[PDB]
XYZ file of C-alpha atoms in Angstrom:
113
model
C 18.068 13.352 29.427
C 18.638 17.043 30.357
C 15.968 19.406 28.770
C 17.729 22.655 27.861
C 21.236 23.880 27.820
C 23.053 21.967 30.703
C 25.779 23.883 32.458
C 29.401 22.662 32.362
C 30.986 21.239 35.416
C 32.754 24.706 35.372
C 29.794 26.974 35.020
C 27.917 24.817 37.578
C 30.587 25.424 40.234
C 30.560 28.994 39.761
C 26.767 29.420 39.964
C 26.419 27.093 42.835
C 28.530 29.255 45.263
C 25.474 31.698 45.334
C 22.957 28.906 46.054
C 22.615 29.749 49.877
C 21.866 33.509 49.149
C 18.936 32.821 46.933
C 15.566 34.216 48.494
C 12.141 32.677 47.985
C 9.020 34.630 48.418
C 5.776 33.427 50.141
C 3.499 32.032 47.824
C 0.439 34.023 46.650
C -2.679 32.932 44.428
C -5.508 33.737 42.004
C -8.184 31.691 40.575
C -6.045 29.342 38.591
C -2.330 29.744 39.657
C -0.201 29.924 42.732
C 2.831 32.404 42.328
C 6.031 33.182 43.827
C 9.247 34.839 42.875
C 12.739 33.974 43.339
C 15.448 36.694 44.099
C 18.939 35.986 43.043
C 22.003 37.925 44.496
C 22.908 40.400 41.929
C 26.483 39.012 42.061
C 25.040 35.632 40.703
C 23.775 37.278 37.590
C 27.338 37.984 36.755
C 28.160 34.264 36.545
C 25.142 33.110 34.923
C 26.287 32.009 31.293
C 25.619 34.505 28.477
C 23.068 32.474 26.733
C 20.683 32.303 29.690
C 20.005 35.980 28.995
C 18.245 37.145 26.016
C 20.086 39.754 24.245
C 17.157 41.969 23.829
C 16.186 43.093 27.427
C 18.803 42.143 29.798
C 16.517 39.811 31.615
C 16.795 36.012 31.912
C 15.083 34.012 29.113
C 12.528 31.305 29.975
C 14.277 28.510 31.748
C 13.129 24.913 31.585
C 12.769 23.099 34.734
C 16.191 21.351 34.411
C 17.695 24.583 33.567
C 16.688 26.583 36.607
C 17.104 23.741 38.991
C 20.425 23.547 37.337
C 21.121 27.011 38.730
C 20.603 26.022 42.287
C 17.076 27.351 42.568
C 15.636 24.813 44.981
C 11.713 24.559 45.274
C 8.956 21.960 45.322
C 7.369 20.178 42.447
C 5.226 21.872 39.854
C 6.618 25.243 39.458
C 6.711 26.924 36.061
C 9.004 29.609 35.161
C 7.299 32.537 33.278
C 8.119 35.717 31.515
C 7.076 38.740 33.684
C 7.021 42.423 33.017
C 10.367 43.997 32.798
C 11.447 43.994 36.650
C 14.997 43.819 37.823
C 16.609 40.866 36.004
C 17.384 39.249 39.270
C 13.745 38.671 40.276
C 12.449 35.473 38.616
C 8.610 34.649 38.603
C 7.293 31.158 38.874
C 3.670 29.641 38.880
C 2.025 26.540 39.189
C -1.587 25.379 38.861
C -4.092 25.155 41.894
C -5.106 21.885 40.846
C -1.604 20.398 41.316
C -1.316 16.877 42.679
C 2.607 16.686 42.699
C 3.257 12.787 41.912
C 6.466 10.919 41.445
C 6.166 8.633 38.319
C 8.769 6.309 37.289
C 8.469 3.602 34.754
C 9.941 0.364 35.989
C 11.554 -2.305 33.683
C 10.599 -5.933 33.479
C 12.116 -8.794 31.302
C 10.205 -9.301 28.075
C 8.490 -12.599 27.371
């Protein structure tokens, strides 16, 4: 049940070619959040589909977790994409709470009575 605008098999192939060139900053923290930023190759920006930018700035819009994992951006559980200042568009900011427990929860089905 994809949240957000899933890429097509065609978009996805085009974006996933840049996956090995994405850079991930060290994490830093304040009183409530850990932060990190992800830096995309400028060339990847060219094949990121048009609806993923917001026409106003030139920056990426807020991405859902499914959306940005969709782009090849690979990091651990808990990270939220948030809107920054107006940096270069190829820098994406992420945060997650310090009080993060990172579980894996799956409902499992039984036969009804």
